[PDB]
Amino acid sequence: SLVVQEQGSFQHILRLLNTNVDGNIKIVYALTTIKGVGRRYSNLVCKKADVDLHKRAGELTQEELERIVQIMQNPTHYKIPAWFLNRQNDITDGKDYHTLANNVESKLRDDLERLKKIRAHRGIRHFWGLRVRGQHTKTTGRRRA
Amino acid sequence: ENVWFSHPRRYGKGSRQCRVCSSHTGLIRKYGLNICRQCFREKANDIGFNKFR
Amino acid sequence: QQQQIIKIRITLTSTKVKQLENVSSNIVKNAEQHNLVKKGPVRLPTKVLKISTRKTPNGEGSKTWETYEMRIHKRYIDLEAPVQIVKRITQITIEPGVDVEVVVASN
Amino acid sequence: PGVSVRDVAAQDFINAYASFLQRQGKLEVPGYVDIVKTSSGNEMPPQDAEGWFYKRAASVARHIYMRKQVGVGKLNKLYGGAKSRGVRPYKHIDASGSINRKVLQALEKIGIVEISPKGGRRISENGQRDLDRIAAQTLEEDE
Amino acid sequence: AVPSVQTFGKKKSATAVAHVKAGKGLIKVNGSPITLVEPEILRFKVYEPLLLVGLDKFSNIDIRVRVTGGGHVSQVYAIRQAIAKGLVAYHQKYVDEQSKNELKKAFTSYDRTLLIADSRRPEPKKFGGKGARSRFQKSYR
RNA sequence: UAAUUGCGAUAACGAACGAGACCUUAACCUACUAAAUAGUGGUGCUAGCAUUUGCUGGUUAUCCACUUCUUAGAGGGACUAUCGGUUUCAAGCCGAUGGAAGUUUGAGGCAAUAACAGGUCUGUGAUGCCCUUAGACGUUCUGGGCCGCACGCGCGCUACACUGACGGAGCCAGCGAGUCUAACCUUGGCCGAGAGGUCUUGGUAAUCUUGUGAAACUCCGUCGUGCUGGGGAUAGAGCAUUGUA
Secondary structure, three states: OOOOOOOOOOOOOOOEOOEOOOOOOOHHHHHHOOOOOOHHHHHHHHHHHOOOOOOOOOOOOOOOOOHHHHHHHOOOOOOOOOOOOOOOOOOOOOOOOOOOHHHHHHHOOHHHHHHHHHOOHHHHHHHHOOOOOOOOOOOOOOOOO | OOOOOOOOOOOOOOOOOOOOOOOOOOOOOHHHOOOOHHHHHHOOOOOOOOOOO | OOOOOOOEOOOOOOOOHHHHHHHHHHHHHHHHHOOOOOOOEEOOOOOOOOOOOOOOOOOOOOOOOOOOOOOOOOOEEOOOOOHHHHHHHHHOOOOOOOOOOOOEOOO | OOOOOOOOOOHHHHHHHHHHHHHHOOOOOOOOOOOOOOOOOOOOOOOOOOOOOHHHHHHHHHHHHHOOOOOHHHHHHHOOEEEEOOOOOEEEEOOOOHHHHHHHHHHHHHOOEEEOOOOOEEEOHHHHHHHHHHHHHHHHHOO | OOOOOOOEEEOOOOEEEOOOOOOOOOOOOOOOOOOOOOOOOOHHHHHHHHHOOOOOOOOOOOOOOOOOOOOHHHHHHHHHHHHHHHHHOHHHHOOOHHHHHHHHHHHHOOOOOOOOOOOOOOOOOOOOOOOOOOOOOOOOO
């Protein structure tokens, strides 16, 4: 089909999302490696970026690894439906606010401060620190509790 | 003369109680029986009796 | 034709002996009093399809119990009688519970 | 002339007629492929990430004779898979129905499959010609 | 009225018609072979009734059957042993006498549920008891 | 030895029960002048190749008869016998194992003898028992806790792999309900990322949701063992179902 004849374009560890990435894996797995992004989201941005799965770290360098990040940030100018994703019409105005790397760990507590402001059961059970999604834990509780 | 002795009773365990002896079991609505477990033994000849096995 | 013989299979089905003896004595005395052909019935291994509403939830302890069993004594007649008297057997001795499968098959 | 009623098989049929239909250009892709999980009872989508519609097409193409007719109510069952409810055992669950109906309608429009009387689908004459003679020719070529 | 009988014949667990089609060793019926299966599990198991007994051994016998009944697992586990009995025993009119005697003497020390035909028949059970190996399902009190 | 089971002698004689007292079992009759849902020749022509007749509808009182599988009633099998020793044969062991059965006939059922300060007085107005009806020994009523955990005990599993995956045939088991005054109601069609949403089709159903179809199994191209692919009793946003809830 295709014989390996690449040259030494593979370079040192590239910088992305203030961390390091392994230079011994496909770029799709390299994207799943980052916090804030998983399997389905990774392959979604990949197959919307239209890149073949026979490319090593030599291709798609740091300058070619910005089209992918920018089309990930901007689903508007390319007809990305952004309803196959999770977050849409969430709390603000109705617009699709797709999930993102730092946005998630900066927004994870807006709902919480809302909930303990209202003083609901989802707030006070969380303040107690016990299990919240409705599981009975009468007997055990050795290590966590 | 009481106004507040009524109460909604149409479905669920709060509506339908036993009819056997004001018993405490028998949550089985088979053919509208709702008969108890000691009551199934009080019933005589509904088991289909025969003994070889 | 006139005086047709299509032979709808009369399916003698009973539960109790008071109705079983009733229908069997009825059909044989009918045959005796209007002189039908002398061919009598015999019983069968009864057509039991297994259906029941059991109320035995959980298996603890030992067995001091009976057997849930019942015999619907579905029998038959090996004869060559007319469809007319086959119909009149259903018309007379009215008791709801006797089924007749519409089957055009004599023997 | 000696050729019997059928000379068909399964794996040779699939992995040959896939490329044969790719040469012929009969894509009939439903458009929203390779975005969906492809089954309500799978862990992830396929890993090739491009097409894989002939992998279903040439499979059903001889399924439609290995069974006399093909029923989607059993197809999604047979394509079902195991799923976990957290701290629970694994349960078999049916596959997707939407994509099955869409590919079936696509091939109906193409004219390979066809809705037969008495409930079910039969194979059209293009598929019948693909079944008998050219299958024998292709396998005699690649064997 | 007319003595028209259907030629009812017996098989392992199903019915059959008693009119065989003779031939020239053609193991098929006119539109489909059966033997090309390729299971990837029971290959040596299906080669056992033939490969140990004689490779072709079909110059004077065909299988000409169409029956709907029994089951698929029963079919696969019965028809091969059935034609094994046909080729080792019914061939006594044809096969060499000392050869078949050697074969029967060889299989006397081989009857370990490999050369046994499936004589299973469906049977209904009665309502009132379900247990086979574990215990029954009864309540206290 | 699964047994108070057989030999054998005797203050022993002759009798019932636990097994023996019975029947369902597991791979059962060229068998039952037994039924159109489980099917066969001739086939009613072929709509898959239509000359290489098995078949597609068994041309909706439908190519006829019947059971040869859906319904199972009888009598019938296997017994250590034909071999020799291991008891003196009077018990019992082997291998030629003989098949609807060499383990008594595998698995199942009789609560036999007579007792338990055993669970059931709170089980059906069941026992010589302490007290009342106006503040009913609270019949009922607006609702909700009856799953709160600093702790340990007990049966039940999701992993600690190249065993995680696409593609496919893997599907060979009876199991269960139905308005008759309220929820069982489609096999198929169509929309959806999916809970799911609408119709000939199911109230007298072997008949319609049911023509119950039980599941991951071998495979190769590729990623690919790690605290990361090994997963989720952990926390968050949105899509709707059964149920006033």
